[PDB]
Structure formats: C-alpha cells, structure tokens
Amino acid sequence: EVDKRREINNEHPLLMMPLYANGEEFNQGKYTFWGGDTLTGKWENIPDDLKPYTVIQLHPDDLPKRDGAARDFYEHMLEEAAKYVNPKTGKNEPIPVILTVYTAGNMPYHTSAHWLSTSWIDKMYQKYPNLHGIFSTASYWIWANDIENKAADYLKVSAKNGGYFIWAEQNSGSAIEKAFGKNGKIAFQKSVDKYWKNLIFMFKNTPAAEGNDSTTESYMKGLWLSNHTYQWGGLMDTWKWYETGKWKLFASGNIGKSQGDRQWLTEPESMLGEEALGVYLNGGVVYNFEHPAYTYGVNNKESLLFSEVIKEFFRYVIAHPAPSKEKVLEDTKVFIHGDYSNKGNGKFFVNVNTDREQTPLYMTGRYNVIPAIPGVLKTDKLKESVSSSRIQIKEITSPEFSSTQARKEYLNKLYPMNYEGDIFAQKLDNRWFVYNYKVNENVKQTGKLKFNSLEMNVEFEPHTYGIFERISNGLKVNLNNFRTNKDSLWSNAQDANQAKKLPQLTKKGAIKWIEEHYIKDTQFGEKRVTKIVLRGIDKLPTIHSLSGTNNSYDQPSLNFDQKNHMVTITINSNGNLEFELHFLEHT
C-alpha cells in the first residue's frame, strides 16, 4: 500500500467543490468556469475551518470534443492549483484537486474526457502531489462496452499513486450491479478485491423519475460495510425537479422535462439538507451537489443554499463525526444480499421506509437505511468482521422480502418502533434527527420523541429538519427550514399547461438569474411556524446561545404550564437556527 494522499472517513469527511469548464470561452483562448468562479478565488473564499475537508473537483463540461482539449484545460488548472500562494502567509500551499476523468460512458460524442488516457492520469498523479483523486460520474444512461475495464484501470492507477478513485452512479438499468460483474464484466470486481481501500462509491440522485434513490443508497452503504469500498457518499442534484416534471412549489400538474433551467432552481434549499442527512446518518462521508450555481454559488460568492444549508450541515458532520463503520455494523440487524433490479428497484422500499416511488427522502428512520450488496458479490469480508456476528445476512429472494407487507413484518420484529407520528425521525446516541418528508405537498407533520422519560413533541412544515440533542443542562436545538420564494420563475403561468410553454430560461439565463435575483435582491420565503413541546419539565426553561440566518427569525416564544410540567416553544422562522434550552426534569 502506497501512503494515501488524504484521509476520507467519518472524522475527515469530504465536500467536493465542482468547477465546470467553460468550453465556449476555451475556444476563445480563455480558461474559465461556467458561473464565473475562478480556481484561486473559489479556494481562497472557502472558510479556513473547511479547507482541510474540501477539494476542488474540475469537470470538463462542454470543452471541445477532440484530443488535447481536456488535457490542456486540466494541465492549466493543475498548474494554478500547484502554484497557489496563501496571501495571509505568503507560503506556497498547493490546492487539492480531483479531476473528472470519466462521464457519459466517455463517448467521443458526449465528452472531451474521452481523450484522457490512463498514462496521462498516471503522469499527472506523479507531477502533482495535490492531485488527490479522479472522478467518474453519470454513465448509468450510457453504459459503455468497456466501462468496467476502464473503471478497473482508474482504481489501479489511483492506488498506484495513493489517490482515490471516486465513482458516482445511480442503479438505473442495474448499473451498480453491472459495475461489480452481474453481466460477466468482472474486471472492476477483481480490481476492488485488491484496491478497495482507494475506492469511494457515491450515489447520484439525478435520474429521479426512475426512483432508484433508496436502492442505490442501500448499495452504497452495504458496499462500504462489506469492504467493497473505502467510504461512500452521494451526489445530490437539484435537477431531480426537472426529471420528475415539477414546477412552481406546491402547484398541481406535471410539466415533464420541459423547463430545465427554471426547474433546477426550484428545489427548496433545506430539502438538500434532508437528502444529506441520509448520507450522514448512515455512515457516509462524501458530499457533492448539482446544479453548482445554485448549490454552491457563482463569481466566487456563496449562494444562500450553500451558506445557510450546505456549509452549516457540513460543519455539523465535522463537529459530530458520522457513525463509524464499526458502529454502523453493530447497529445493523439485517443485511440484504442480491439484486434490487429483480425486485422492483425503488419500489422495494415504497411504504416500507419511503412514501412514494420518486423521492430522495425517507418517511421513517426505524430501519434507517437497510444495507445491501448486488447478488454478484460475496459477503465473505462482511462475515470476517468482529462487529458483524449479530447481523442477519439475507438473500433478497427470501420470502421475508417477497412483498411490501412481508418486508415490514420481518423488519419490525428486528427494528423496534422507537417514536410515534407520521414524520421522519431517527435516533443516534442522545440526538433525535427529525424532518418533514413531504416533497411537494404543503402538509404539516407531527411526531413524539423521547429522551428516556422526557417527551418532546414537534410540529414541522415541509422542508424542515431539526437536530435535538439532550445535553447535561438541557436540550441543544439545530433547526433548518430555509426556503426562498421561487415563484417569480413561474410567473405568467397560472397552470401546468402555461408553465410548460414559458420561454426557456436557458443555462446562461439561469446563471444570470442567480446573479441578479439570488445572490442579491433575493426573494426570501415567509417566516413559518415550528412548534416544540417538552413534557416532564420542572420549571420554565431558559434560552441560551440563540443564533441563525440573519433577519430570518422572531424571538422564540416559551409558554410554561407549571401544573402540567410542560413548555410549548413556538418558533417563527425561515433559515437556519440554533439555541440551547436549559432546564431540569420533573421527577
């Protein structure tokens, strides 16, 4: 084993920071990124506490489809990253980089990345110590004849150099199963056997109309737990709103895939945090997002989605490392072996822990994410673990998994019910994680959670998540319901028929919209109410360390009922929010 170029694990998570090459400006002799970020400017503006955990991911986007274009662009940027000088100290501090080397099956009619050989990649790894890995993304829809063979070579060249091969893929058309050798292409399977410690596998939730969210994330988790990948994560993509044909928030009717650039702006900001929780809460540690202009920002500035949701969330997972592989293994009661493609794909979990076929969210944390691996793999390395002796390893073809009812009946006997209410909740140590699981329906949800004898009832509007931690002197609360008003994008359309016929915003139009109406002159959403009720309280709680998104919240209201030893907390907000409540329990 060659020394790893960086650590990626629960204590050292990874936020990938995408920069998409501007192919049009490249033809004009310029080296630039769509959205106006610059390599140096972007890096400098990453907060210093995040710098150790963030890596610039170059993507060749629409660079010309011919030999030399991607190499030329990439070498230019690697040179800039390598020569970076910290202006605060004057020292040369090379910027860590990942190169996107494979995408869209590397078809010469799809991507300039086709003309990046393994020899060139080896050469860059040897020249640039700051090149930490290479990235393959989104070939599920164009599964090239040699994709597994190429993947094997990418992992091996990364291992050779101590870097990481990162592959983001969704289980559309059995992609994850094929990658590990389902259809007899076994080169990557053999590669993984030798080099799994340099592999990161992520979901890519883009193709949302196919509903493979739950099954792909299950695989990513199970691959990790069974030592087929070093760590896992997900790429969470606001393009899901386009794929599923949604338009104005909560509006009725479906417009299909007809208004791409309005659509990828519309996903509520806080909902990305809800998606990211499914990674964190299940031991995943790698995070990436599209569309980059909305999810990260433009012109070296943070978008509000980034500043108020993603940055906060990522800081959270650094401060509170995700459950270790050992811990997840200890908590795992069922591990599935077999192919979800032969059991309805995403339908497998519908009305088990997901509320519909097309959603990136869960409706209960009761089973958290049930881990699985494709039928083609073996559970040998899983069973070798000191931490796996209490796991039921089951074939997906078992009668326990044959229908929706059978799955719930079997899982319920092994995963006890641990809260009440129709709402998402999952518990980790002294922390309750809660979210409203509605995607595009304006319906409040409620739940009742317990910290031993202390009862906490919550009421949440859609696109709201909370983390509630029982601390020695009370309760720490982190809340996030940040959702700006996107209606202006859908103005002039009173129904789906008219919405579908709006003039295209276009890629350039959307980037301009972000600059003019999101980075500034933002149409913030209305403050909305969250209720928290605590029962079993001695005296009126006191509030401490209250902060949140600037100008986004009213002072929380506490109403203590002495006779019933209970407090009703009413919050009116739209943003991120944090405080502590200090109290003693009534005994």
Ligand X SMILES: CC(=O)N[C@@H]1[C@@H](O[C@@H]2O[C@H](CO)[C@H](O)[C@H](O[C@H]3O[C@H](CO)[C@H](O)[C@H](O)[C@H]3NC(C)=O)[C@H]2O[C@@H]2O[C@@H](C)[C@@H](O)[C@@H](O)[C@@H]2O)[C@H](O)[C@@H](CO)O[C@H]1O
The residues of the shown chain that bind ligand X, judged by CB under 6 A, are 20, 34, 59, 61-62, 103-104, 137-138, 141, 206-207, 239, 242-243, 290-292, 507
Compute how many other C-beta atoms are within 10 angstroms of the C-beta atom of residue 548.
21
**Minimum distance between the CB of residue 96 and ligand X, rounded to whole angstroms?**
19
When the beta carbons of 177 and 290 are compared against ligand X, the nearer one is 290
Residue 21 CB, shortest distance to ligand X, in Å, is: 9
Minimal distance in Å, beta carbon 290 to ligand X?
A: 4
In contact, 412 and 398? CB cutoff 8 Å:
no
CB of 438 to ligand X, least distance (A): 22
Q: How far is the CB of 62 from ligand X (least distance, A)?
A: 6
Radius of gyration of the chain (CA): 24
Q: List, in sequence order, every residue forming a beta bridge with 167; answer none if it has no partner.
A: 136, 201
Give percent helix, percent strand, percent coil of the chain, each to the nearest 5.
Answer: 35, 25, 40
Closest to ligand X by CB, 61 vs 148, is 61
Does residue 82 sit in helix, strand or coil?
helix
User: CB of residue 575 vs ligand X: minimum separation in angstroms?
Assistant: 25
Give the Cα separation of 195 and 51 in Å (integer): 27
Q: Please report how the helices 118-127 and 69-83 are oriented relative to each other, as an axis angle in degrees rounded to 10.
A: 10
Considering the complex, state which of residue 239 and residue 401 has its C-beta at the smaller distance from ligand X: 239
Q: How far is the CB of 238 from ligand X (least distance, A)?
A: 8
Q: Return the closest-CA partner of residue 57 out of 100, 102, 14.
A: 100
Distances (CA, A) of 225 to 133, 146, 203, 324: 22, 27, 15, 10
Q: Which pair of structure tokens corresponds to residue 268?
A: 């509520």
User: Under DSSP, is residue 563 helix (H, G, I), strand (E, B) or coil?
Assistant: helix
CB 234 within 8 Å of CB 287: yes
Please identify, using beta-carbon distances, which residue of 137 and 303 lies nearer to ligand X: 137
CB nearer ligand X, residue 61 or residue 355 = 61
CB–CB of 371/201 below 8 Å? no
The verdict on whether omega for the bond into residue 291 sits within 30 degrees of 0, i.e. cis, is yes
Q: How far is the CB of 510 from ligand X (least distance, A)?
A: 9
Beta carbon of residue 20, minimum distance to ligand X (angstroms, whole number): 6
Nearer to ligand X, 169 or 177 (CB): 169
- Per DSSP bridges, beta strands 424-428 and 164-168 are unpaired
Query: 495-512: buried (b, 16+ CB within 10 Å) or exposed (e) per residue?
Result: ebeebbebeebebeebbe
Per residue, the 3-state secondary structure of 214-236, as one string, reads HHHHHHHHHHHHCCCCCEEEEEE
CA atoms within 13 A on the CB side of 445: 22
Q: Which is nearer to ligand X, 31 or 141 (CB)?
A: 141
Instruction: Closer to ligand X by CB, 102 or 451: give it.
Output: 102
Q: Which is nearer to ligand X, 235 or 479 (CB)?
A: 235
In the complex with ligand X, which residue's Cβ is closer, 153 or 243? 243
Q: What dihedral angle (degrees, nearest 10) is formed by the CA atoms of 507, 511, 514, 516?
A: -120
Minimum distance from residue 495 beta carbon to ligand X (Å):
24
